Amino acid sequence: DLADRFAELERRYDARLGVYVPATGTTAAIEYRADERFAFCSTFKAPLVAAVLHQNPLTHLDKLITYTSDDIRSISPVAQQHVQTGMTIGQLCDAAIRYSDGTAANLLLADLGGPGGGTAAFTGYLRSLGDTVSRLDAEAPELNRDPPGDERDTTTPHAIALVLQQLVLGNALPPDKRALLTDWMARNTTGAKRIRAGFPADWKVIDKTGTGDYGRANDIAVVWSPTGVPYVVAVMSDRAGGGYDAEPREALLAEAATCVAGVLA
Structure with a gap:
């Protein structure tokens, strides 16, 4: 039984686990703690x-964004290398998705603009x-740090799954912008030990991971x-x-995904 398996994983990893897979043609939704809040971390x-992408013409991808030393405040594998040259909006999107570049995502929030450094407009996009x-409510690094149970910077497995479904499978974006997002997630470099690890090789997986304090580890995918x-x-x-320094456990997500894949096979 699925719920029994997910409960067993919680005990194994001393963790709280949330899972959602929306209903399809022939499968019921899979849900476990799906309406409980969990920090977004980098899945946002x-x-x-x-x-x-939605807010701008496609050629906004070619706009050069400049930034400085005091902008590097979080893990930023790509942006830390381009402070002198700047990065185009397209390079920022690529880095934010594929390398989970924190500076890139902060710069994209600022591009979206408005109150809260773009966080209010981000939330409005979800609405x-x-x-x-x-x-x-916060950008990096603050967004990964809220105490367990705090509602700031949270989503739920159910909510984020329905959002991702609209973005990749539905009509939230025009086809050209939808393809850009889909391809960046398809080329993600950070997800090999999470949902990808639970699905057989002949299934296609695109994803976006997140990791935070208090042992936070997330992955959202379309397969x-x-x-x-x-x-x-x-x-x-x-x-x-485990408190603030609790180790994130990727294996919990790989095992949860293996269980989901077993049901979907």
Whole structure:
């Protein structure tokens, strides 16, 4: 039994686990703690890139953004190398998704603009997609640090799955922008030990990960079966019992995904 398996994983990893897979043609929704709040962590960067793509003509991708030393305040594998040259909006989107570059995502929030350094406009973009649950209140590094249970900077597996479904499978974005987002997630470099690890090699997986304090580890994905049937998979976790420095456990997400894949196969 699924729920029994997910409960067993919680005990194994001293963790709280949330899972959602939306219903399809022939499968019921899979849900475990799906309406409980979990920190976004870096998973917000996927709808962030969608918001920026949606807000602007496509050639806004070619606009050069400049930044400085005091902008590097979080893990930023790409942006830390380009302070002198700047980065174009397209390079920022690529880095935010594929390398989970924190400076890149902060710069994209600023591009979106408005109150809260773009966090209010980000939240408004989610509201436009019918998500009345999620909220973004801070940028990096603060957004990964809220105490367990705090509602700041949170989504739920259910909410983020429905958002991702609209972005990748539905009509939230025009086809050209949808393809840009989908391809960046398809080329993600940070997800090999999470949802990807739980699905057989002949399933396609695109994803966006997040990791935070209090043992936070998330992954949101769209997967396609070998015959092209898509499913959206959101898996979220934290480990409050280990305190602020609790180690994130990727293996919990890989095992949860393996269980989901077993049901979807």
